[PDB]
């Protein structure tokens, strides 16, 4: 994970400053477990998840199942957040996702900017924005 | 070709009236800049940018420096039009503004449009943009409007 030339050089750039931002960074770190049943405990009943190039899942069940599905084909290997901010109950994270395709054994660093919506310390919404094509090509695995 | 103007509120969008409005001076500059994008006028837009700045539509190579940004944005405006923007959420922290939007982009060679779901980050110092990065999927756009920007 190279520090992009545009990443802040401030020692606090990618660190938490509120309880909600803290919940997210911990949830981000937990992703490396590739355990949907574990991660769903971070989510509220009324929630949704969407990797924006792909369709969205609505409901705590749909999110768990979607994450489980993703984990049968891909390993969350590492994360680093270069910027984190929040406002009005939404947490934004500019980060890098190291993803590893199990069927083909290839890996690619995905530049991601995500948004989280939290109520009472639980996630009511999660959307990651990135380019799907370049990831697919780099790991020889189509996901659409 | 036809394409409707009304942009539907996503099911996941916040119904908090404050979520989509500017609460600080840095957030207001960004919303002004997002309304100024419909001008497709690099010369008008670069006035928002500092000398030490950068811009990158992440699926495409970045541009560093004020001159590079202007030429890159101008280049875009020869092939695509910026027809409309709606920002569902805008947030702010430690000099970085974030905006969850839909960019209604139209390909000039074909006349076709597409709603691009975008999440963006802006870096500001003294009210001038030192950085702008928009995260989205490019293939969705290329295929929808039949305008190839990457080979």
Numbering used by the authors:
A (entry chain A): 5 to 148
B (entry chain D): -1 to 149
Reproduce passages from the article.
We report an in silico strategy for the biocatalytic synthesis of chiral N- and O-heterocycles via Baldwin cyclization modes of hydroxy- and amino-substituted epoxides and oxetanes using the limonene epoxide hydrolase from Rhodococcus erythropolis. We turned to cofactor-independent limonene epoxide hydrolases (LEHs) that normally catalyze direct hydrolysis of epoxides by positioning and activating water at the active site. On the basis of the well-documented mechanism of ReLEH, a water molecular is positioned by H-bonds to N55 and Y53 while D132 abstracts a proton from the water, enabling a smooth nucleophilic attack on one of the substrate’s epoxide carbon center. We have rationally engineered the epoxide hydrolase ReLEH with construction of a general platform for Baldwin cyclization reactivity of hydroxy- and amino-epoxides and oxetanes.
In curiosity-driven experiments, the mutants SZ612 (Y53F/N55A/I80F/L114V/I116V) and SZ621 (Y53F/N55A/I80F/I116V) produced only the Baldwin product 2 with none of 3 nor of the vicinal diol 4 as side-products. In order to gain insights on the active substrate-LEH interactions, the X-ray structures of the key variants SZ612 and SZ616 were analyzed. Consequently, the representative substrates in complex with LEH mutants, including the models SZ612‒(R)-1 and SZ616‒(R)-1, were constructed by molecular docking. Following the docking analysis, the epoxy ring O-atom of the substrate consistently establishes a hydrogen-bond interaction with the protonated catalytically active D101; the aforementioned hydrogen-bond network with water molecular is terminated by substitutions Y53F and N55A, enabling the substrate distal hydroxyl moiety to form a hydrogen-bond interaction with the deprotonated D132. In model SZ612‒(R)-1, the dihedral angle θ was mainly gathered between 0o and 180o during the MD simulations, suggesting that attack from the Re-face is unsupportive for SZ612. Moreover, for both of the SZ612 and SZ616 mutants, the slightly shorter distance d1 was observed during the simulations, indicating that the ON atom preferentially attacks C1. Furthermore, to better illustrate the bond forming and breaking in the Baldwin/anti-Baldwin selection pathways, the hybrid QM/MM scheme was employed, enabling the calculation the activation energy barriers. It is of interest to note that the shorter distance d2 allows a relatively low activation energy, and hence the formation of Baldwin product is favored for the two variants.
